[PDB]
Amino acid sequence: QLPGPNADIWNWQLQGLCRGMDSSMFFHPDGERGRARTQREQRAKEMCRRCPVIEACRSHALEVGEPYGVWGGLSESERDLLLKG
Amino acid sequence: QLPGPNADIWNWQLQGLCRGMDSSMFFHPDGERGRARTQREQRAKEMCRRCPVIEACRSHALEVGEPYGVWGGLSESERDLLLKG
Amino acid sequence: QLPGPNADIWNWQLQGLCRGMDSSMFFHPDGERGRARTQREQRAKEMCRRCPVIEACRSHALEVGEPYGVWGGLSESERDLLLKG
Amino acid sequence: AHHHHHHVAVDAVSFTLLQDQLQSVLDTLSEREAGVVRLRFGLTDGQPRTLDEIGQVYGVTRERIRQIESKTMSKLRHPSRSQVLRDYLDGSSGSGTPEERLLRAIFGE
Amino acid sequence: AHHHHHHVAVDAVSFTLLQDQLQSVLDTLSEREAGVVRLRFGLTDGQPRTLDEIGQVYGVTRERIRQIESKTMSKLRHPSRSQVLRDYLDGSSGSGTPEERLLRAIFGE
Amino acid sequence: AHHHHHHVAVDAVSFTLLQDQLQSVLDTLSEREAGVVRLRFGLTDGQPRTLDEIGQVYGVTRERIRQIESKTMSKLRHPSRSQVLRDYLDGSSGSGTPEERLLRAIFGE
Ligand code: SF4
Ligand code: SF4
Ligand code: SF4
Ligand code: NI
Ligand code: NI
Ligand code: NI
Ligand code: NI
Ligand code: NI
Ligand code: NI
Ligand code: NI
């Protein structure tokens, strides 16, 4: 296994639907603003809503902590609102 | 030990009589034909017939599989005839 | 641990008082003769006589064997006299 | 020509980490993200940089460099591309190297 | 200058394999046998070759290259010269290296 | 540029020994002591020298070289500077290397 809190990510990531894709579907380029941003997020989410390990992905991002990217069908700001309010 | 079917060759090879010799006494140069070939084989065999681990050498070559070289006092063709007929 | 007779030196060396110092307080330059020699030794010994692991240092040098340097508040010649007479 | 590697232990787990496989990990990042990683940990020259020194390089605040680092770590662990990380961390296996192929030929199967 | 080595695991046994000791193994082969090994497994440039590509190099059939490979593996395992292979596969021991001699001096005996 | 290292086993304990950390160990010795070590164990060129050959280099007797070697080993183990030796012998940990810092960033804490 890996050391630290991410010790067990390999248990589920090998089944993720996004496994082949470029990270660009799940992360915003640094400058991105307006329309492009939201259109990227909803594309990523359409994949998560078909993914068999969405629950494990969502749980990793919220409970172990991933500040950036779409994980588990949730955007960065969705997770920040859930965790910090 | 080693992985695979050759796992245990070190158990006996350290006692082989040929341990110091160049591989040329036991393997034919690629082009070799006629007299030279047979004269090489019988020289190799004279050594095997004095060797303390001849039985283990012969068993390795026939049962684990060595297609080339003189092993256990047997030539390549002798072993091919025994195994395939 | 380490292999060999020095297996356990780390058990005590981390508490030695000389831990920060240059080895020059405890070893004579190759050429050193007369006054300088003895003045080096007594300086080293003033430190050992304040050191919490002097007993372990002395025991290592005498029983495991360190031919050179001041160890345990003892000079090279002091240890040679104790061990060989 | 491919041999440069490092041995590291973190919390009593050991890793063999190949420079070529690290380069494959960094290739998945943006140019600025990969540069921040190289400066922050001293991959360029053995010497770590402070967040302010890196911000000087890229003309941004220390806080933006902190955010770039955080985003990079999320990127490296995301399931989309995390096989490149897995491959890097499993460098001790030698999988797909000339020597591993040779040994499998010698040993059979 | 002697340091190039590879770490590999085959069926959960680990090996440290030194380029200099691999060269000693290859030196026991004919020039064509050693060249077939280098091309087949990608020792020359990281890239394995097909049996047909190697046969193109040596002007022989794919089947002759298969036989050359088979003969090579028998040669490497034969008891006459198999100590060179043993030495290669035991590279993790560092036996006969400057650093192993130094450590034995520091540790005693 | 920092990668050169050797794997050695002595009495069934394994070591990873970095050339840069060996240089730090040798830096604590006198120039002649460090040179005797390099010649005696073959660090310069893979080839050990006899005590008489080394004495030829330094214009001293074989017995003086024996004493220089003995004094060196005492120096390396003395508690004053023995942390440099500890650091060298613990090279498998990768402590204070760019890759260990990177892995701790990826893994957290
Ligand atoms: S839930 Fe989304 S981000 Fe997570 S593995 Fe599945 S597809 Fe990838
Ligand atoms: S039987 Fe022949 S080939 Fe086998 S080890 Fe003995 S001498 Fe060598
Ligand atoms: S007894 Fe002297 S030499 Fe030994 S550790 Fe203490 S101060 Fe250092
Ligand atoms: Ni290389
Ligand atoms: Ni190589
Ligand atoms: Ni080298
Ligand atoms: Ni070296
Ligand atoms: Ni290594
Ligand atoms: Ni290097
Ligand atoms: Ni490096």
Contacts of E77 in chain D (CB under 8 A): 106
Distance of alpha carbon E69 from alpha carbon E74, whole angstroms: 9
Cβ atoms of D64 and D70 within 8 Å: the answer is no
Q: Is the CB of B45 under 6 A from ligand 2?
A: no
The CA-atom distances, in angstroms, between F83 and each of A69, B45, C10, C65, F26 are 44, 60, 9, 20, 13
Instruction: Find how far residue D37's CA is from the centre of its chain.
Output: 9
Q: F99 and D14: CB-CB below 8 Å? A: no
Method: X-ray
Block residue for tokens 């259109």: A39
Say whether F53 sits in a helix, a strand or coil. helix
Looking at the CA of D19, name the nearest ligand: 10
Residues D25/D73, Cβ–Cβ less than 8 Å:
no
For B13, the closest of E12, E28, E82 (CB atoms) is: E82
Instruction: State the Cα–Cα distance between residues B72 and B84, nearest whole angstrom.
Output: 18
Pairing of strands D13-18, D5-10: antiparallel
* CA of residue C56 to ligand 3 center, whole Å: 9
State the smallest CA–CA distance between residue C7 and chain E in angstroms. Answer: 8
B16 lines ligand 2 (CB under 6 A): yes
Pairing mode of beta strands E13-18, F5-10: unpaired
Residue B5 marked ligand-binding: no
The structural domain count of chain E equals 1
**Could you tell which of B54, B55, B64 is best to mutate to test the pocket of ligand 2, judged by most ligand atoms within 8 Å of the CB?**
B54
Assign residue F74 the CATH number of its domain. 1.10.10.10
Sign of the C-alpha dihedral computed for residues E55, E61, E62 and E63 taken in this order: negative
DSSP code at position D94? -
For A36-52, give the DSSP string.
HHHHHHHHHHHHHTT-T
Gap from CA of D84 to ligand 5 centroid (Å): 21
Contacts within 8 Å (CB) and 24+ apart, E17-24: E17/D99, E17/D103, E17/E88, E17/E89, E17/E91, E18/E88, E18/E91, E19/D3, E21/E84, E21/E87, E21/E88, E21/E91, E22/D99, E22/E88, E24/E84, E24/E87, E24/E88
C-alpha of residue F3 to centroid of ligand 5, in Å: 14
DSSP C34-62: THHHHHHHHHHHHHHTT-TTHHHHHHIII
Residue F8 vs residues B50, E95, E100, F13: alpha-carbon distances, Å:
38, 7, 6, 8
DSSP string, B16-84: -GGGGS-GGGTS--TT--THHHHHHHHHHHHHHTT-TTHHHHHHIIIIII--SS-BTTB-HHHHHHHHH
Q: How many CB atoms lie within 10 A of CB E47?
A: 11
Give the C-alpha separation, B41 to B53, whole Å: 18
Nearest CA in chain D to E9: D93
List C-alpha distances in Å: D58 to D38, D51, D62, D64, D83.
Answer: 13, 11, 10, 10, 29
What is chain F's length?
109
Quote the CA–CA distance of E25 and E87 in Å, as a whole number: 9
**D89: containing domain:** 5-107
Query: Is residue D43 within 8 Å of residue F102, measured between CB atoms?
Result: yes
Interatomic CA distance for residues B79 and B68, integer angstroms = 9
Note whether D71 and A67 are within 8 A (CB): yes
Any chain F CB within 8 A of the CB of C47?
Answer: no
Q: What is the DSSP letter of A74?
A: B
Of residues D11, D19, D41, nearest to F102 (C-beta) = D41
Q: Report which secondary-structure segment, H or E, holds D106.
A: helix D98-107
Q: How far apart are CA C43 and CA A36, in angstroms?
A: 75
| Residue among C30, A49, D88 nearest F103 (CA) | D88
3-state SS class at A4:
coil
Task: Write down the domain spans for chain B.
Answer: 10-84
CB under 6 Å to ligand 1: residues? A 16-18, 47-48, 51, 53-54, 57, 71-73; D 79
**B8 assigned ligand-binding residue:** no
The answer, yes or no, to whether any atom of ligand 2 lies below 6 A from the CB of B57, is yes
How far apart are the C-alpha atoms of B1 and A39, rounded to whole Å?
Answer: 58
Q: Which ranges constitute the DSSP H helices of E1-109?
A: 19-26, 31-41, 51-58, 62-77, 82-89, 98-107
Atom of ligand 1 nearest to the CA of A19: 8
Among C12, C23, C47, say which to mutate for ligand 3: greatest number of ligand atoms within 8 Å of CB.
Answer: C47
What does the block give as tokens for A34? 């307006």
Give per-residue burial for B21-57: e unless 16+ CB within 10 Å, then b: bebebbbbeeeeeeeeeeebbeebbebbeebebbebb
Rounded (5°) CA angle E103-D8-F44:
35
In DSSP notation, D7-76 reads: EEEETTEEEEEEHHHHHHHHTTS-HHHHHHHHHHHTTTTS----HHHHHHHHTS-HHHHHHHHHHHHHHH
Cβ contacts of residue C8 below 8 Å, gap of 6+?
A: C1, C2
